[PDB]
Every structure is written in C-alpha cells, then in structure tokens.
Design a binder for this molecule. Structure first.
Ligand code: U7Q
Ligand code: U7Q
Lengths: 205, 205
C-alpha cells in the first residue's frame, strides 16, 4: 500500500502537475497521475473502485462523501469561436444562449452549474481537442482553458467572445478534493502550499 | 421616466457605490440606490413591480428572464467565529458541517448554491449585523464580507477559520445584472469600466 492516486482535469495546465510530481513523489511509495475532462472528475472520484486520493479540478460539488474540499487558486478560460462566427462583435451572453456551442459532454449526461451548457443548440464532445476542432470549423462557440487557445488566439485562428462578460478571461476557481485520511499528513500540506504558489505563478504568464 | 434604480447587496463595500453615484448621476433624471442582503438581491429584482434596472450582487443565477449578467470583479469574505470557539485550530471545513453557524436567511426560505448554509445547526438572520452579534456571542460561526470583520479581526474580537480552505480570504465573484434595455446605453459601459476599476482598487486595500 501507500500508493497515491492523483487526478487532474484538463483545465489545469500540464506544467502545474510538475509540482505535484516533484513534491509528493518522495513521501509515498508510488505516485500516479490521471487526467480527465473537467466534466468527469467528480464522477470519477465518486467511484469507490477508482481509489482516487487527490483530485485537482475546477468542477464544484458542495459535499462529496469521504472527501474534503479546499481552494488551490485560479485559472482562466475563454469563450472562443471561429473568427468569422456571426457573434464576433461582442450583446455578449444575450446572444450566446441561442447559438450552437461545443460543450464538454459527460459520461453521465448530467452537469453541474459551472459546466452545464448555456445554449439549447448544444453539441457534446468528450475533450477539448474535439471541441476546438468543431469551433475552428465554424460549427459553434465553446468555453476552453487559456493554455488550449493561447496559440490560436494570437494567430487569428480564433477569436474571444467573452471580454464584455469578464474582461481578461473568465477567472475559474481551482479546487482540490482529497481523502479524509490525508489531513493527518505532513506531505499534503507541503503539497498544498506548493500547488497554490504554482497556480499563482502560472497566473502571471 | 428615465429613473435608474440600482441595487447593491451588503457584501459590496459602501465606498464602491460612490462610483455608481458619481458616474451615472449625470446621465439619468434620477438615480436611486437600494441595498439588500445578498440572499434577497435576486428575488428582489425578479419582482417586476420592483423596477430594478441594475443589481450588483455576489449571488449567482444562471438565467433570470429580462436580465443579462456580467462580472464586475471580486471581493473577499471570511469564515469567522468567537476567538474561543471550539474550532479555532483550523480540519477546517470537515468540522464546520457539524457546528452552528449564523447564516443569512432569505424571505423565501430557499437558497442558491453559493449562499445555502453548509451545516445543519443553522440559525438564520436577516443581516450581517445580527449575524455577528450572535457570532461575537459564541453562538456559532459565519461567513461575512471583509469590510464587516476587518476591525474585529485585527482587535482579537474575532478569529478566522478559513485560512486552510482558501488562504487570504474566500474570493467571491461580484456580478452585475441589468435590464436588457441598457446594453444600448453609452452610460452603462462607462459605469461598467468604472465599477470594475473600483473593485480592482478596493482589492488592494
Ligand atoms: F458566456 C459565458 C459562458 C460560460 C461562462 C463560464 C464559466 C465557468 N467556467 C468554465 C465553464 C466551462 N468550462 C470551463 C473550462 F473548462 F474551460 F475551464 C470553465 C461565462 C460566460
Ligand atoms: F467553510 C466554508 C463556508 C463557506 C464558503 C463560501 C463561499 C461563497 N462565498 C460567500 C458565501 C456566503 N456569504 C458570502 C458573503 F456574503 F459574506 F460574501 C460569501 C467557503 C468555505
């Protein structure tokens, strides 16, 4: 035993996990890293069989039995669309409720408040890569993490629709859920401090 | 006609409203300022009779007919309790679900995710003053805005319980809901820029 299993959703930057990997490797037998869609994180850890000890995700649930919650920091996500998508005036949310958007589907078909689509023209996809395939094809708009659309936004391939809603990008809170057996661990607090400093650093890029 | 009615919940600092008062006074016949509990803001504007044109509140609702939503910035709120309240070790949320807290009741008895109490020992109050009466009396803990508990926290009269949950204070997003008739107003955009800069300034204090 003593095998730590950590879950990160694909809204967390890959660079972030470096800290996870460096800090708590030494304090456990074996550290395992798993990535899921933000829409599958909570449902994944709520499978007892899955034996997830730590989850780092933007999804929010009030009380998930046998898990505590704490905040690690913030990330950025933008509403993006094809640069010639009808809505590129930025009215903003008013219009979005009526056009197609590629939003992250879930294996359970249900969604939280944070991630439930806003429109009724909705096309579910499993991952951000498919989302942005369809979005770069004019099929609809979509909400995606910063690090996914950085390249494309500065290359004209994509346009931001959410500067009136929240200038600078939709700041999304990043939560850490974890086993009630870890509060009594020195490691875990070292990890929390390091992860918080790390998100704080990534925010400055 | 042309009487602007603006609503602010008591989680927004009073100083903030100064900008509101200065910026849009000149562009309307008459500007009226109304303050409500964060738990009464949305329900208040959803009364058609109330004729609210702008609401500035931390409460969140996905879609409220005849109103658009946008983000103005962030404020801070802390979980506070009597300095000798049992829980002053800061376990954190784990324990809070089982002790009494004075949380903001609503006139409708229903609550959003953001504001629905966490415990089952719950004592509803109408306003933050009553909340902190009972909290300074050891009766329970409570979530209150920064500017309410600043004085008391630096004077030992109060203690913070939520530094492990989110060090620095629970950052709460501040929304602005407004009439679909105001998107077509120059005033409103001036107000948005000014209000956003204002919350950004207040964050630095
Ligand atoms: F017009 C809109 C549409 C959506 C939002 C929002 C929000 C909450 N934040 C997220 C949601 C969905 N997805 C992500 C992320 F996975 F990309 F991070 C982050 C704001 C204005
Ligand atoms: F253990 C806890 C308990 C509650 C929270 C939270 C939250 C959301 N933010 C607010 C909620 C209720 N009230 C306010 C305010 F009105 F004071 F701003 C702000 C975090 C950890």
């Amino acid at each position: 035993p003593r095998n730590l299993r950590v879950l990160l959703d694909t809204a967390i930057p890959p660079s972030f996990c470096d800290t996870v990997s460096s800090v708590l490797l030494d304090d456990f037998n074996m550290v395992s890293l798993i990535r899921t869609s933000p829409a599958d994180s909570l449902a994944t850890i709520k499978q007892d069989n899955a034996e997830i000890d730590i989850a780092i995700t933007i999804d929010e649930e009030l009380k998930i039995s046998r898990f505590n919650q704490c905040v690690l920091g913030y990330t950025k996500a933008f509403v993006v669309a094809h640069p010639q998508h009808p809505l590129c005036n930025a009215h903003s949310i008013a219009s979005l409720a009526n056009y197609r958007q590629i939003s992250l589907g879930s294996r359970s078909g249900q969604h939280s408040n944070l991630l439930r689509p806003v429109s009724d023209k909705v096309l579910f996809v499993e991952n951000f890569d498919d989302m942005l395939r369809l979005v770069e094809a004019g099929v609809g708009w979509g909400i995606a993490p910063h690090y996914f659309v950085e390249e494309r936004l500065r290359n004209g391939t994509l346009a931001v629709l959410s500067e009136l809603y929240e200038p600078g990008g939709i700041d999304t809170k990043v939560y850490c859920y974890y086993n009630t057996a870890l509060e009594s661990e020195r490691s875990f607090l070292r990890f929390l401090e390091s992860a918080r400093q790390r998100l704080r650093e990534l925010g400055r890029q």
